């Protein structure tokens, strides 16, 4: 029983799937859902924005990582661990990693329209929740994300 992991995977999977398919999921989010929905709304707003201005860089990275299929996620996990290896953790880095995950997911859908986004979403969620567990907990998890990116 791991609610933070469950919640994180739901948020990230939903974002990746929407981005990949172009369609929103009309199914009530699990327990919580209030924070999750606001997190997903935040992720749409800021994640789309990251993808903007950085299309060239993202394409560059996709190409260099040569991600061949829905299951080829080991290299991305390594890259994410490497990003955090200077010892710095913040929501800008996290949203950028998730946004890049959505970028990859979109591209995998073009090559194969039957591609599952779950391996990618699981790989990203694993890095975030497992390696930043206490950092997330201290901050009431996704509330930290919501408030950091909150605009009036």
């Amino acid at each position: 029983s791991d609610e933070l992991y469950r919640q994180s995977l739901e948020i990230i999977s939903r974002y990746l799937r929407e981005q990949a398919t172009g369609a929103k999921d009309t199914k009530p989010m699990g327990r919580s859902g209030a924070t999750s929905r606001k997190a997903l709304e935040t992720l749409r707003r800021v994640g789309d924005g990251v993808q903007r201005n950085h299309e060239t860089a993202f394409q560059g990275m996709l190409r260099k990582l040569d991600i061949k299929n829905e299951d080829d996620v080991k290299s991305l996990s390594r890259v994410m661990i490497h990003v955090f290896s200077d010892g710095v953790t913040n929501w800008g880095r996290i949203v950028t990693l998730i946004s890049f995950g959505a970028f990859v997911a979109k591209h995998l859908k073009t090559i194969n329209q039957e591609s599952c986004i779950e391996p990618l979403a699981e790989s990203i969620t694993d890095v975030l929740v497992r390696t930043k567990r206490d950092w997330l907990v201290k901050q009431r998890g996704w509330d930290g994300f919501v408030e950091f990116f909150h605009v009036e």
Partner: peptide, 22 residues
Amino acid sequence: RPEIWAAQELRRIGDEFNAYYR
């Protein structure tokens, strides 16, 4: 290595976005 370069790139963008929202 492509993996080191990708990490450098994602970190640059990540910190930029962090600094943006403060």
